């Protein structure tokens with residue numbers, strides 16, 4: 001019963017590697033922000049019309065996401081085993097998980113003090129309204145907040161945070177993949193590491209059940225990924241939208 005096997009040198013290495021990768025791609029100071037198109041916040045205490053009409057926050061948020069995408073790609077390119085897939089299976093995994101990972105790593109800036117994401121600087125504080133001004137409806141934004149709170153109350157160790165993202169990326173069930181068995185093998189190595197860290201390092205532990213809760217989020221993420229895709233498609237229907245985006249955002253979601 002309740003065996004708690006010690007972490008293997010290889011498993012330790014993997015975490016070290018993943019931890020380090022994340023430090024090199026996540027900026028907790030948010031210093032690069034002034035290099036994005038400026039936030040514009042029109043008063044819209046509504047309007048789906050004002051919103052689409054203006055799209056005042058889109059250029060800034062499209063810039064952030066785009067920037068983050070780049071940081072997510074850099075992270076993927078440091079997952080052990082990720083180099084060993086055909087670059088074709090790499091892009092497929094990347095594109096189809098890019099938004100899921102962003103929602104995970106944004107939790108580092110999400111604050112349960114006012115249910116927002118703070119990257120600033122009141123300028124770089126993002127509340128529900130700030131995402132509607134970017135042309136989004138409550139069907140995605142409201143479930144997203146709950147996801148972040150559900151995620152916060154897991155009280156994840158940074159070690160578990162980086163592994164969750166690593167697993168999210170290297171999923172063998174994504175549409176378009178060629179070598180599902182190889183991708184599957186890497187995920188098991190990553191998932192096994194997670195279950196083992198939980199057993200060894202997490203207090204009490206009377207609840208290694210934490211693992212079941214973490215896999216559940218990855219399923220929330222699929223819903224959100226699909227919902228986002230719906231809403232993106234509406235934005236692209238809006239004329240002049242393309243310039244408010246970036247060629248990366250356009251490629252990934254189009």
Ligand SMILES: C=C1/C(=C\C=C2/CCC[C@]3(C)[C@@H]([C@H](C)CCCC(C)(C)O)CC[C@@H]23)C[C@@H](O)[C@H](OCC2(C#N)CC2)[C@@H]1O
Nearest residue numbers: 025026027028030062065068071102103105106109117126
């Ligand atoms: C992306 C991140 C941040 C916020 C993410 C947010 C806050 C605004 C609300 C966002 C942007 C959602 C919407 C759906 C994004 C929509 C994007 C378009 C309009 C293109 O579809 C999804 C993710 C949400 C900010 C911050 O928490 C993180 O980025 C910070 C920096 C990085 N990397 C670390 C410096 C994280 O990577």
